[PDB]
Design an enzyme around this catalytic site. Structure first.
Site, PDB file in Angstrom:
ATOM      1  N   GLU A 151     -12.412  13.767  12.783  1.00  0.00           N
ATOM      2  CA  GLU A 151     -11.702  13.001  13.803  1.00  0.00           C
ATOM      3  C   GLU A 151     -10.569  12.175  13.206  1.00  0.00           C
ATOM      4  O   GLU A 151      -9.479  12.105  13.784  1.00  0.00           O
ATOM      5  CB  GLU A 151     -12.681  12.108  14.564  1.00  0.00           C
ATOM      6  CG  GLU A 151     -13.627  12.884  15.462  1.00  0.00           C
ATOM      7  CD  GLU A 151     -12.933  14.027  16.176  1.00  0.00           C
ATOM      8  OE1 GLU A 151     -12.054  13.757  17.021  1.00  0.00           O
ATOM      9  OE2 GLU A 151     -13.255  15.198  15.881  1.00  0.00           O
ATOM     10  N   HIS A 165     -14.202  27.936  27.764  1.00  0.00           N
ATOM     11  CA  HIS A 165     -12.745  28.011  27.702  1.00  0.00           C
ATOM     12  C   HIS A 165     -12.182  28.932  28.778  1.00  0.00           C
ATOM     13  O   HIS A 165     -11.122  28.649  29.350  1.00  0.00           O
ATOM     14  CB  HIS A 165     -12.311  28.474  26.313  1.00  0.00           C
ATOM     15  CG  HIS A 165     -12.792  27.585  25.210  1.00  0.00           C
ATOM     16  ND1 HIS A 165     -14.072  27.655  24.704  1.00  0.00           N
ATOM     17  CD2 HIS A 165     -12.170  26.597  24.526  1.00  0.00           C
ATOM     18  CE1 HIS A 165     -14.216  26.754  23.750  1.00  0.00           C
ATOM     19  NE2 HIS A 165     -13.076  26.097  23.622  1.00  0.00           N
TER      20      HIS A 165
END
Lengths: 99, 652
Positions: B413, B543
């Site tokens: 991150e 997705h």
């Protein structure tokens, strides 16, 4: 956002030194006349500054003051602190009382 | 020798005074607007194009002013929009829900208006690449290029599948009211319980309730996605997604959408021998676990891979471990031994990120971001996301715990946001990654370097007395192959599947069957229960239902491998590539920052060339990374037949 401050993003020419431009004319970015209003090729040069507590360090509202010093034919007025020493008596010394 | 340019009111004066014009002195006449150059014994007329009517206001000037005005205001609107989303993501509340509803509405309406304004700024007369590229992104109407009804129905169909996928629930036949969602009710039971029957039922039930329902919706979604793709000058919606990778007008670095397909296919073909060895050994371990359910030659079951889509074999790492008696590499217990928390994890991540030479980042993110779930008073999301809020504001959403998995994701991150503010000099439009496979690659490369045993020993995560034998290296390599190399064939094929689904080459009555045919010949995985075209198993992907291109993952894997290899080459790493660490290497960080600052302004192909040295992508780092594992798989394939068989099925 602290939108009180505005910045002249656009101008018809570069400002001369020590000159202030405050006119709020609608900037004409193109050949289309602005007619006093924004739109196609017409924007506001004095865009708004946005300042928030969580903004970037280089984006923080920075208070900048510039102190230009003017020396002309007029008498000098803004002098320095001109610190003074202590006082001695009955001793051969090199003194200086206001020049 | 020097000269100049001379002028005459009329050509009669030019002819009289042409004798006095020295060679190299240009002759200009305003009456005829003709230019001449003084040559040896005469004057040669200079060819001049059509006379412009002094267009002092070009479209380039107007576009630049419009772009600057847009970027200044777009920064504020996106900034406050990102704040509201972060507030909701840190505190889920009813007042928060309406916050993005208003913020998204204003941002969307603002974006469409600027896109509308940019429509009268065609790119043909624009010569600045940055201006042309930024306006091309601005002029991207997307769903609004078609009529309003087509856009409205496409959005409604998109919302329907997104809701259906979110609420996709299956109930046991014996207990009608006992139902489990896909996340995490379905995923937990199949990843933990190795039972063939329970996994098969969950796999079958999930594809029956979701595949049947979404089949008409997906087909209508695909048809509409082809409708505005050609309205956007793309042969299919797959080409519309591939337009991001396309590079035009850059001599020596131009890239085409078709070139991406060819290179991706070429990379997969050469990768195939390594994947076949891994598939053979994973199959070999599967007969070791279940001898009567998997053939030594047949393809692997769809539900017996750890992922119902067959994405990751990480859940099979325990079942397919090269050596189950050798302990795995993990220093989580050492963190609690040293009394570490999520704050220390990020603090050590920054220390690692400054040991590589890159400068320390500000204190605003630390006080504006949480690293642990904010109790239970306020609900927060723990999904790994990077917040590019703008205005020099960057945040990370993560309920990081004191674990190695959270340690690596925390590294992932911060690498994301470290990529975000690296190109802060770029404008608002250009403040993004060059492609969708770059932001994840940046966070992956150094997180792996942090996970290297050398990094753990350097900062005390692992004891210096730890021994680094081939057994642990092979076990680590296989886990990397299962998690990273294992998902490559699934990633490549599904995007390949969805591409021709948009193209329409494979008819609707063959899509899923072609998928399963591709699952067998290409992926090497066979479904455990036969179905009909009502099943829409590829659409069961998150997705596909949420309109996300899947090529990002396969590209990111090869991008991160190239990045890691360049990092090791810059660091002059010696030995196995999987043990290569970039820590305490200032030069490696500087070389990475050479493209981190570049951003998306330059073509991604040029960025890839700057990193490694090749304009086009290559699989060379894969061989260097997994060479000990490739030899181990070759040696251990004495009973693992290389490849698979399309004919064999769990049901046949």
């Amino acid at each position: 956002g602290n939108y009180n401050y505005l910045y002249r993003l656009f101008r018809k020419s570069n400002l001369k030194p020590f000159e202030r431009d405050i006119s709020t004319e609608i900037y004409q970015a193109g050949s289309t006349p602005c007619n006093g209003v924004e739109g196609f090729n017409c924007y506001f040069p004095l865009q708004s500054y946005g300042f928030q507590p969580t903004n970037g360090v280089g984006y923080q509202p920075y208070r900048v003051v510039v102190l230009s010093f003017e020396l002309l034919h007029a008498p000098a007025t803004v002098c320095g602190p001109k610190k003074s020493t202590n006082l001695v008596k009955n001793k051969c010394v090199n003194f200086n009382f206001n020049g | 020798g020097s000269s100049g340019v001379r002028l005459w009111a009329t050509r009669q004066a030019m002819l009289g005074q042409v004798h006095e014009v020295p060679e190299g002195w240009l002759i200009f006449v305003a009456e005829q607007e003709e230019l001449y150059v003084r040559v040896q014994n005469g004057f040669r007329k200079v060819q001049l194009e059509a006379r412009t009517p002094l267009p002092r206001s070009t479209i380039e000037e107007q576009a630049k002013t419009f772009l600057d005005k847009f970027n200044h205001e777009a920064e504020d609107l996106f900034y406050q929009s990102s704040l509201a989303s972060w507030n909701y993501n840190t505190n889920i509340t009813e007042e928060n829900v309406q916050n993005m509803n208003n913020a998204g509405d204003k941002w969307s309406a603002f974006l469409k208006e600027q896109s509308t304004l940019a429509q009268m700024y065609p790119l043909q007369e624009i010569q600045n690449l940055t201006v042309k590229l930024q306006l091309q992104a601005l002029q991207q109407n997307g769903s609004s290029v078609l009529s309003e009804d087509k856009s409205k129905r496409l959005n409604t169909i998109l919302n329907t599948m997104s809701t259906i996928y979110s609420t996709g629930k299956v109930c046991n036949p014996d207990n009608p009211q006992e139902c489990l969602l896909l996340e995490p009710g379905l995923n937990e039971i199949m990843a933990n319980s190795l039972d063939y029957n329970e996994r098969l039922w969950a796999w079958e039930s999930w594809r029956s309730e979701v595949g049947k329902q979404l089949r008409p919706l997906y087909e209508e979604y695909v048809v509409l996605k082809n409708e505005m793709a050609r309205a956007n000058h793309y042969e299919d919606y797959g080409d519309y997604w591939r337009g991001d990778y396309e590079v035009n007008g850059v001599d020596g670095y131009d890239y085409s959408r078709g070139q991406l397909i060819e290179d991706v296919e070429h990379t997969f073909e050469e990768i195939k021998p390594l994947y076949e060895h891994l598939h053979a050994y994973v199959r070999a371990k599967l007969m070791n676990a279940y001898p009567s359910y998997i053939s030594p030659i047949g393809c692997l079951p769809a539900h017996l891979l750890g992922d119902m889509w067959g994405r990751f074999w990480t859940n099979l790492y325990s079942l397919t471990v090269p050596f189950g008696q050798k302990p795995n590499i993990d220093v989580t217990d050492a963190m609690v031994d040293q009394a570490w928390d999520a704050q220390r994890i990020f603090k050590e991540a920054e220390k690692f990120f400054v040991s590589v030479g890159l400068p320390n980042m500000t204190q605003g993110f630390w006080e504006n971001s949480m690293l642990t779930d904010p109790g239970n008073v306020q609900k927060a999301v723990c999904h790994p996301t990077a917040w590019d809020l703008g205005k020099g504001d960057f945040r990370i959403l993560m309920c990081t715990k004191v674990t190695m998995d959270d340690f690596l994701t925390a590294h992932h991150e911060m690498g994301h946001i470290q990529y975000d503010m690296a190109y802060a000099a770029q404008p608002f439009l250009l403040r993004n990654g060059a492609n969708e496979g770059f932001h994840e690659a940046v966070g992956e490369i150094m997180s792996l370097s942090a996970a290297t045993p050398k990094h753990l020993k350097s900062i005390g995560l692992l004891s210096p007395d730890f021994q680094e034998d081939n057994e642990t290296e092979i076990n680590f390599l296989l886990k990397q192959a299962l998690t990273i190399v294992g998902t490559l064939p699934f990633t490549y094929m599904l995007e390949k599947w969805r591409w021709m689904v948009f193209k329409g080459e494979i008819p609707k009555d063959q899509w899923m069957k072609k998928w399963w045919e591709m699952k067998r010949e290409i992926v090497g995985v066979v479904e455990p229960v036969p179905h009909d075209e009502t099943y829409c198993d590829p659409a069961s992907l998150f997705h596909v239902s949420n309109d996300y291109s899947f090529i990002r993952y396969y590209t990111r894997t090869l991008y991160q491998f190239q990045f890691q290899e360049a990092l090791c080459q810059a660091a002059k790493h010696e030995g196995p590539l999987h043990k290569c660490d970039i820590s305490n290497s200032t030069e490696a960080g500087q070389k990475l920052f050479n493209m981190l600052r570049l951003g998306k302004s330059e073509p991604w192909t040029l960025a890839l060339e700057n990193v490694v040295g090749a304009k086009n992508m290559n699989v060379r780092p894969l061989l260097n990374y997994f060479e000990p594992l490739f030899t181990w798989l070759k040696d251990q394939n004495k009973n693992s037949f290389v490849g698979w068989s399309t004919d064999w099925s769990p049901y046949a």
